[PDB]
Design a protein around this ligand. Sequence first.
Ligand code: G4P
Ligand code: G4P
Ligand code: MG
Ligand code: ZN
Ligand code: ZN
Lengths: 50, 50, 49, 521, 76, 38, 149, 142, 351
Amino acid sequence: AVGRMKFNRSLLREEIEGSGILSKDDIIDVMKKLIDIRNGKGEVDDIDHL
Amino acid sequence: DIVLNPLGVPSRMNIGQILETHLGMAAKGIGDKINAMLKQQQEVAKLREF
Amino acid sequence: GQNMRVAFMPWNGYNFEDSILVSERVVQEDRFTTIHIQELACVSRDTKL
Amino acid sequence: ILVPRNTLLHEQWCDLLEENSVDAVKVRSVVSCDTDFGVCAHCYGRDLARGHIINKGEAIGVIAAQSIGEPGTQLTMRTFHIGGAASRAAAESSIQVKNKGSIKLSNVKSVVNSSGKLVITSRNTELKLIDEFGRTKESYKVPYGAVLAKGDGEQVAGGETVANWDPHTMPVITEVSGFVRFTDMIDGQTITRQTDELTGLSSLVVLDSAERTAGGKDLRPALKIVDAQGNDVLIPGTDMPAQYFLPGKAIVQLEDGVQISSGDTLARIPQESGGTKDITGGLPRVADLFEARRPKEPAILAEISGIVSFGKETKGKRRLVITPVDGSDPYEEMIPKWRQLNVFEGERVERGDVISDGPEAPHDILRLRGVHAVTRYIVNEVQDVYRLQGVKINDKHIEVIVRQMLRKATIVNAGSSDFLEGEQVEYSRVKIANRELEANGKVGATYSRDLLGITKASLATESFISAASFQETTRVLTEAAVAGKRDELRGLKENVIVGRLIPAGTGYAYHQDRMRRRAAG
Amino acid sequence: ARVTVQDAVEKIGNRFDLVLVAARRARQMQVGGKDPLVPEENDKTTVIALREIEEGLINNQILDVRERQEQQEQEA
Amino acid sequence: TEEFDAIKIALASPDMIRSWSFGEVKKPETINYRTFKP
Amino acid sequence: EIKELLKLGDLPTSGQIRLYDGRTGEQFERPVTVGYMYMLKLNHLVDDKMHARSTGSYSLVTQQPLGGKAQFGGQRFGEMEVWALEAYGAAYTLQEMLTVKSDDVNGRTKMYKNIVDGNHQMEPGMPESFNVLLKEIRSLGINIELEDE
Amino acid sequence: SSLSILAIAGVEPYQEKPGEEYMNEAQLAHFRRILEAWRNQLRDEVDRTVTHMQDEAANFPDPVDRAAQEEEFSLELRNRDRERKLIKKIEKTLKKVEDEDFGYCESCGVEIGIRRLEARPTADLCIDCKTLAEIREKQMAG
Amino acid sequence: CAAYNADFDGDQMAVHVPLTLEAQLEARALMMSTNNILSPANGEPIIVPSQDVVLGLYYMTRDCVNAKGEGMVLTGPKEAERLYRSGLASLHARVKVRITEYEKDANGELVAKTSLKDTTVGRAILWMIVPKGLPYSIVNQALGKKAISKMLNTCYRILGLKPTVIFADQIMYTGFAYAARSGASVGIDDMVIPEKKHEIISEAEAEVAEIQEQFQSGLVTAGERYNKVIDIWAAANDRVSKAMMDNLQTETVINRDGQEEKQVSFNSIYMMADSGARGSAAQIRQLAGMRGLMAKPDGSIIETPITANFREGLNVLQYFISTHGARKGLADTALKTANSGYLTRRLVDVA
Ligand SMILES: Nc1nc2c(ncn2[C@@H]2O[C@H](COP(=O)(O)OP(=O)(O)O)[C@@H](OP(=O)(O)OP(=O)(O)O)[C@H]2O)c(=O)[nH]1
Ligand SMILES: Nc1nc2c(ncn2[C@@H]2O[C@H](COP(=O)(O)OP(=O)(O)O)[C@@H](OP(=O)(O)OP(=O)(O)O)[C@H]2O)c(=O)[nH]1
Ligand SMILES: [Mg+2]
Ligand SMILES: [Zn+2]
Ligand SMILES: [Zn+2]
């Protein structure tokens, strides 16, 4: 539930609780956001955060 | 009781121990003053007031 | 721990470095005497002899 | 004579040497010491916990390593690039004499101009200052093309400007007189007409192959210095007719038809050369300096002497051909475009002069300039780092290390070896002494020194038990097992491993005795 | 001379075979083949041998010459 | 105790390997578990 | 606030008082800071740290002396210490330290007897670790023999 | 106020005259003086730093005060590095002034204000292009 | 201790016993402490006084405008010492003393020159120790860390080892003695906040206000603002530091018989600084001045400084930033030492 919460928060979705397994829409949105950040419409995250 | 080397203060930038020494000397001064007023057994009133 | 009367000054280089000089008065009163409870075990096994 | 041949210089000798004004002293160094399998007491000297000359037997190697290792914690763990270089030359144009002394020129050949100034056409010129009693107070480096005011010998008062030149400008200087004749100096083919009005200004750009049209690829535009009669007048004292190959952007002020006096600037060529020596320091720079890592884009030097010239144009590396006047011509070296060149085509360079600006790789220094030059360079370069933090070390230790780095040579001649094998300099030197003392040459054999970074040098150890002690054990054990190599131990760490007497110090006598007992009756 | 061995190094300049000479002498003293040549100050034989070396009474030449002398005497 | 020097390294030939060895170790057993004799 | 409270105690507001040297009786120049500070006795007690060993138990495979406190211990000269000794011309101390003191069995016993008898000689032998090394490399197909000339 | 960049030199803010042309001899000389003073000051500060660094450095026996004495040096060297990076920019600006090509934006030919040049004498671009480039940079970086 | 890099805070040492007779000799001859006083790196002495000694000597030799026994003429150093120990004169007070120095002028002969020098009581008492061969000039001066080391060095160069060892021991004993008699300590009021701190701070803040105003005008993007502010803050920091040190050093305005004068103060912390026993100007700054600008993790320098000092009290943010800097340094030290060891080992392997 935490993993899903963080995953949906990173992709700006209102929905908090998901199904554990990766729906393929997830992967597609992931690649969309990756190419977005590669274009420059986003900030890179640091793994230092608390 | 203890004789401490002064050359440890300025290069070790921990100056808090010096203020600690001062405030502690003042606290024991109060304690002495109360011990003195009790050894003479002045009166409840005077000890209470002080 | 405990609170002692300290004086900041060099006393014939016995506190040369971070070392500390202490007066017999503290040991006399036994105010830094610790109790340590150590355990010892003697085990008697059975050898083939 | 105030100091007889090799004497140990103790404090009092130094005091006597100071009261006089001796400037330079040849001192025997450990690097050049001649004895094989160790060093000689004298070349090393005294300096130790005791006062005296080194006693035979002391392990100087580990002493030096210890002394160079103990410090290195005052130094910061990064590579701070303060790069300030506080004490500059106050400006870039004029020189400023600090103390009143005689002016003395080193390594130059000047050309008196029409006003009568010694315009210097030498790249390696220095201008020192002699003091009252014969010593070098001030020393300055004057670049190529700087007009002077006072020449050589005359006394300069305190704070007099003795030299002047435009920084961002490398002048082309004519040595003889007569009319300027244009060669291949066609309008459109080799130059681009950007012309001013009456006073005769131009912005002519000598275009390289790319910007020159399809016909002007090989056309070398030149400025011939001819006389009234026609024949090419020769530079004073030399037979070369001065054919100044005008490089790119040679702004020819004096057009064709103006009698140039001997020493007038031919054409302004702009060069925005960096004028600051960024200081570098801290620990890792030291490790890298001691590991002899090929630096970044290295500066280049000349290999043999002789008049330089260009070669096949613009293939991605412009050619430089050094042709020796006497020896064979054929040394062409390709060079990348981004390198800036210091010498004109029609110039006579010497071997190991600077050709490009930047950092020199110690390997080149050793190969061209030789041993003492590389050792001095290393010593000074590290010592600068160590003094930057204020840790004092005597040079002798760094010197022993440098000697350990040069342990190896490579044979180019023949006669007893494999003609190409990297071989220790000691075996080569003993075999050369043998051959040359015997009747037969064989051939030979000529060698060249090579410089190794302390790690590789360590890896090139002879005895295999040490190398197995600190190297990848499997590799050394395998190679030595196949080679059938035989270890006499000869070293310190070997004997430690076997638990017998190290050959250093108190035990040297023991081993010395054994050496005499071996190979005896 | 258990402070500075400077005078022994002034006698023997190697500063290493010094310790070997002193060891030979002090072992010649320990196994009681000989007796001390200097009045002892309740010292052990190490500093005794150093004291003998520093005054020029004993060195390598005196050890070898006197040793072969005593040897040839003991031959009879 | 010998006075030696020069330590030599070479591939061991099979006859040398037989030379050093005193016997062939045929079975993997170690000890009797009852009496711990080998 | 400290100044105020010190005044309430009737003590010098600067917090320094003149002290007399208890040995001679002379006063100290420049009064010195005195006062109470809270100190702690840490668990690092000299009673535990002190340790010495003459002779004791040795290890099974590599005949070195055991390291530690339960077993007497026996510090350890490392390469850095070796280098230090090599820096001097100190060959005999290094030699004993390397063989007679740890790994040479016969040497160590003979030296025990010599010391007890009041003689000081030595007999270095071969360090046991080196013998183990020979046997371990020989276990491979690598012939390592001590040659003679 | 004696704390800006005009303070380093003994110069007070210029004042373009009514019919004063843009780049005249006097303005160029002014800016050269300013830059030269700034530089010489920075280099003298580097000399101070180095003398300090050379005097202080010592071997401390406590690991929690060697870090104390090597955590102020890191900051000091940081500032010195930054100013060294600015010495190359000042050098380049001094080259543009000597070349008489100073005061105009490198992207668009518009001339950069005199008051901005008295503000940050090393300015290479106009405020508009500067802002756009800074945004593009910060966006392509993160 | 300097040779061992040892400090008495629970550091431990090992003790080995050389067994054979030859080992005993090698230890006593080559390895003995007294034989190795010169550093193998450079020729200079290693055993120089460290911290407490230097403080004692600095106090003992330092001169003062006015005290007890100004202008007394003493027949010799022993009488000087008799005067000090009886309390008829301060341990430092300007005085005319007769002293007999010896000179190695001839071929190793000592020639006594005996005349009247103008020195301190303390300097004579110290001159008692000095062995014969040294010129008086050596001790006549302030006698700090540098000067004391040079003193020892010259003693070595002229006489030789034996006397230098004895002179070093004597120096230690005397330094400890007179350091104890001085009674120097460190009180809260000994670290004086310069009167003009807040003035310079207000000026720097006014300048930041002006730079903000010139930002709102649109002459500078944010980057120029950041850089410019950081530079003005650095300059303000250095100026305040220098002003505090000026206040601190020469503030003892002591008076002679009539009019007054000013001199190198006897502020305990200042003497502890200047003698070279502990501390440098930077640390004194951080106690009594503003502890400058600080850096965040990434190497970027935070724009706003602390402005507080340890005599005063810091606040949450300021302490947090100081944590950044401190812990960064603390984590770097370990790695640095562990890699310097490796460098030294691969440098010993080659040679
Ligand atoms: N560091 C130091 N050493 C001092 C001092 N005063 C005396 N010594 C030295 O200590 C040694 C004194 O030892 P002894 O007097 O013989 O008495 P002992 O039986 O305890 O050894 C002497 O050196 P020695 O071993 O006897 O040398 P040598 O004269 O025999 O050659 C002496 O020079 C001092 O103040 N400081
Ligand atoms: N003391 C000082 N240094 C200056 C100043 N201006 C620029 N620098 C330093 O020189 C570097 C060069 O900056 P630029 O790349 O030219 O960027 P810019 O046009 O905004 O100045 C700066 O990079 P930087 O990225 O800002 O450095 P940093 O942030 O990585 O530490 C900075 O470190 C200045 O006015 N004063
Ligand atoms: Mg410690
Ligand atoms: Zn030699
Ligand atoms: Zn623009």
